[PDB]
Amino acid sequence: MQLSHRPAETGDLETVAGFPQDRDELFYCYPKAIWPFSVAQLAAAIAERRGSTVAVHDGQVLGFANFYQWQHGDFCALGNMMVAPAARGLGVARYLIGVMENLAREQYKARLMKISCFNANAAGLLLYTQLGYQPRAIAERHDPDGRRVALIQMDKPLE
Numbered sequence: 001m002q003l004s005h006r007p008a009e010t011g012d013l014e015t016v017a018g019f020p021q022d023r024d025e026l027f028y029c030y031p032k033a034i035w036p037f038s039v040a041q042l043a044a045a046i047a048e049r050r051g052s053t054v055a056v057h058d059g060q061v062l063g064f065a066n067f068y069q070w071q072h073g074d075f076c077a078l079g080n081m082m083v084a085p086a087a088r089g090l091g092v093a094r095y096l097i098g099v100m101e102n103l104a105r106e107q108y109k110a111r112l113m114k115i116s117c118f119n120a121n122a123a124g125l126l127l128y129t130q131l132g133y134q135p136r137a138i139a140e141r142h143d144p145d146g147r148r149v150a151l152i153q154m155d156k157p158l159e
Protein backbone atom coordinates (compact mmCIF):
# COMPACT_ATOMS: atom_id res chain seq x y z
CA MET A 1 0.00 0.00 0.00
CA GLN A 2 1.15 3.67 -0.56
CA LEU A 3 0.38 4.84 3.00
CA SER A 4 0.82 8.29 4.51
CA HIS A 5 -0.03 9.80 7.86
CA ARG A 6 -1.06 13.08 9.47
CA PRO A 7 -2.73 14.39 12.62
CA ALA A 8 -6.45 13.66 12.74
CA GLU A 9 -8.69 16.56 11.71
CA THR A 10 -12.39 17.45 12.24
CA GLY A 11 -13.23 16.37 8.77
CA ASP A 12 -11.94 12.85 9.38
CA LEU A 13 -14.32 12.27 12.38
CA GLU A 14 -17.31 10.95 10.47
CA THR A 15 -15.14 8.43 8.58
CA VAL A 16 -13.29 7.12 11.61
CA ALA A 17 -16.45 6.90 13.70
CA GLY A 18 -17.80 4.55 11.00
CA PHE A 19 -15.03 2.02 11.51
CA PRO A 20 -16.29 -0.11 14.45
CA GLN A 21 -18.79 -2.58 12.96
CA ASP A 22 -20.42 -3.83 16.16
CA ARG A 23 -20.36 -3.64 19.97
CA ASP A 24 -17.40 -5.98 20.26
CA GLU A 25 -15.20 -4.09 17.91
CA LEU A 26 -16.13 -0.77 19.70
CA PHE A 27 -15.36 -2.30 23.10
CA TYR A 28 -12.08 -3.67 21.94
CA CYS A 29 -10.82 -0.30 20.68
CA TYR A 30 -12.62 2.10 23.03
CA PRO A 31 -14.12 0.37 26.08
CA LYS A 32 -15.42 3.62 27.68
CA ALA A 33 -17.52 4.35 24.55
CA ILE A 34 -21.23 3.45 24.31
CA TRP A 35 -22.75 1.89 21.24
CA PRO A 36 -23.72 3.37 18.83
CA PHE A 37 -20.42 5.22 18.29
CA SER A 38 -20.63 8.86 17.21
CA VAL A 39 -18.52 11.73 16.14
CA ALA A 40 -19.02 13.44 19.55
CA GLN A 41 -17.67 10.43 21.39
CA LEU A 42 -14.63 10.26 19.10
CA ALA A 43 -13.99 13.99 19.43
CA ALA A 44 -14.17 13.72 23.22
CA ALA A 45 -11.52 10.96 23.15
CA ILE A 46 -9.30 13.08 20.93
CA ALA A 47 -9.67 16.09 23.27
CA GLU A 48 -8.52 14.15 26.27
CA ARG A 49 -5.74 12.19 24.63
CA ARG A 50 -2.59 12.91 22.58
CA GLY A 51 -1.18 11.96 19.28
CA SER A 52 -4.39 11.26 17.35
CA THR A 53 -3.15 10.25 13.87
CA VAL A 54 -4.78 9.00 10.71
CA ALA A 55 -3.31 6.74 8.01
CA VAL A 56 -4.30 7.58 4.46
CA HIS A 57 -4.09 5.55 1.22
CA ASP A 58 -5.34 6.76 -2.21
CA GLY A 59 -7.22 9.66 -0.64
CA GLN A 60 -8.98 7.49 1.92
CA VAL A 61 -8.62 7.60 5.71
CA LEU A 62 -8.12 3.91 6.56
CA GLY A 63 -6.68 3.97 10.11
CA PHE A 64 -6.67 5.90 13.36
CA ALA A 65 -4.83 5.68 16.67
CA ASN A 66 -3.83 7.75 19.65
CA PHE A 67 -2.20 7.65 23.09
CA TYR A 68 -4.30 7.37 26.25
CA GLN A 69 -1.22 7.51 28.52
CA TRP A 70 1.94 9.46 27.90
CA GLN A 71 4.79 10.01 30.36
CA HIS A 72 7.78 12.06 28.93
CA GLY A 73 11.01 10.06 29.11
CA ASP A 74 9.20 6.92 30.04
CA PHE A 75 6.42 5.39 27.98
CA CYS A 76 3.25 5.92 25.94
CA ALA A 77 0.18 3.61 25.80
CA LEU A 78 -1.48 3.27 22.42
CA GLY A 79 -5.22 3.07 22.07
CA ASN A 80 -8.25 3.72 19.93
CA MET A 81 -6.66 1.51 17.19
CA MET A 82 -9.27 1.46 14.41
CA VAL A 83 -9.04 0.33 10.83
CA ALA A 84 -11.61 0.58 8.04
CA PRO A 85 -13.35 -2.75 7.43
CA ALA A 86 -12.39 -2.88 3.70
CA ALA A 87 -8.71 -2.44 4.62
CA ARG A 88 -8.28 -4.93 7.41
CA GLY A 89 -5.30 -7.31 7.21
CA LEU A 90 -3.57 -5.20 4.51
CA GLY A 91 -0.98 -3.67 6.80
CA VAL A 92 -2.70 -0.46 7.90
CA ALA A 93 -2.55 -1.24 11.64
CA ARG A 94 1.07 -2.30 11.45
CA TYR A 95 1.94 0.87 9.56
CA LEU A 96 0.15 3.05 12.07
CA ILE A 97 1.72 1.24 15.07
CA GLY A 98 5.14 1.97 13.51
CA VAL A 99 4.19 5.64 13.08
CA MET A 100 3.04 5.86 16.70
CA GLU A 101 6.28 4.19 17.93
CA ASN A 102 8.31 6.88 16.16
CA LEU A 103 6.06 9.60 17.51
CA ALA A 104 6.47 8.18 21.11
CA ARG A 105 10.29 8.03 20.78
CA GLU A 106 10.67 11.38 19.09
CA GLN A 107 8.09 13.59 20.77
CA TYR A 108 7.78 11.93 24.19
CA LYS A 109 11.32 10.49 24.50
CA ALA A 110 9.59 7.22 25.42
CA ARG A 111 11.64 4.12 26.01
CA LEU A 112 8.66 1.75 25.93
CA MET A 113 5.28 1.43 24.22
CA LYS A 114 2.43 -0.24 26.11
CA ILE A 115 -0.56 -1.84 24.36
CA SER A 116 -3.49 -3.50 26.06
CA CYS A 117 -5.63 -5.95 24.13
CA PHE A 118 -8.80 -7.81 25.20
CA ASN A 119 -8.65 -11.58 25.22
CA ALA A 120 -11.25 -12.01 22.52
CA ASN A 121 -9.23 -10.00 19.99
CA ALA A 122 -7.03 -12.79 18.58
CA ALA A 123 -6.06 -10.74 15.55
CA GLY A 124 -4.80 -7.97 17.78
CA LEU A 125 -2.82 -10.30 20.05
CA LEU A 126 -1.15 -11.94 17.08
CA LEU A 127 -0.30 -8.66 15.34
CA TYR A 128 1.20 -7.03 18.41
CA THR A 129 3.21 -10.27 18.97
CA GLN A 130 4.48 -10.14 15.36
CA LEU A 131 5.56 -6.52 16.05
CA GLY A 132 7.70 -7.54 19.01
CA TYR A 133 5.32 -6.78 21.87
CA GLN A 134 5.51 -9.20 24.80
CA PRO A 135 2.81 -9.96 27.39
CA ARG A 136 3.48 -8.57 30.81
CA ALA A 137 0.28 -8.98 32.80
CA ILE A 138 -3.38 -9.97 32.67
CA ALA A 139 -6.04 -7.79 34.35
CA GLU A 140 -9.70 -8.45 34.96
CA ARG A 141 -12.15 -6.07 33.34
CA HIS A 142 -15.89 -6.18 32.64
CA ASP A 143 -17.63 -5.94 29.30
CA PRO A 144 -20.94 -4.05 28.69
CA ASP A 145 -23.02 -7.05 29.76
CA GLY A 146 -21.16 -7.24 33.06
CA ARG A 147 -19.22 -10.36 31.98
CA ARG A 148 -15.56 -10.81 33.03
CA VAL A 149 -12.95 -10.40 30.33
CA ALA A 150 -9.10 -10.53 30.45
CA LEU A 151 -7.15 -7.51 29.37
CA ILE A 152 -3.70 -8.60 28.19
CA GLN A 153 -1.13 -5.86 28.91
CA MET A 154 1.80 -6.00 26.48
CA ASP A 155 4.88 -3.84 25.96
CA LYS A 156 7.90 -3.26 23.66
CA PRO A 157 11.13 -1.28 24.15
CA LEU A 158 11.52 1.49 21.59
CA GLU A 159 14.71 1.65 19.48
Ligand SMILES: CO/N=C(\C(=O)N[C@@H]1C(=O)N2C(C(=O)O)=C(COC(N)=O)CS[C@H]12)c1ccco1
Nearest residue numbers: 028029030031068078079080081116117141142
Ligand atom coordinates in the same frame (compact mmCIF):
# COMPACT_ATOMS: atom_id res chain seq x y z
C1 LIG B 1 -9.53 3.06 33.43
O1 LIG B 1 -9.09 1.78 32.91
N1 LIG B 1 -10.22 0.99 32.61
C2 LIG B 1 -10.03 0.27 31.57
C3 LIG B 1 -8.80 0.28 30.74
O2 LIG B 1 -7.83 -0.42 30.99
N2 LIG B 1 -8.86 1.14 29.74
C4 LIG B 1 -7.73 1.43 28.87
C5 LIG B 1 -8.07 2.46 27.75
O3 LIG B 1 -8.44 3.62 27.81
N3 LIG B 1 -7.87 1.56 26.82
C6 LIG B 1 -8.09 1.38 25.42
C7 LIG B 1 -8.56 2.62 24.72
O4 LIG B 1 -9.61 3.17 25.08
O5 LIG B 1 -7.82 3.10 23.81
C8 LIG B 1 -7.99 0.18 24.94
C9 LIG B 1 -8.08 -0.06 23.43
O6 LIG B 1 -6.78 -0.68 23.03
C10 LIG B 1 -6.53 -0.81 21.73
N4 LIG B 1 -5.50 -1.67 21.59
O7 LIG B 1 -7.14 -0.21 20.85
C11 LIG B 1 -7.82 -1.12 25.68
S1 LIG B 1 -8.26 -1.01 27.46
C12 LIG B 1 -7.35 0.51 27.72
C13 LIG B 1 -11.10 -0.57 31.14
C14 LIG B 1 -11.30 -1.40 30.09
C15 LIG B 1 -12.59 -1.97 30.27
C16 LIG B 1 -13.11 -1.46 31.35
O8 LIG B 1 -12.23 -0.58 31.96
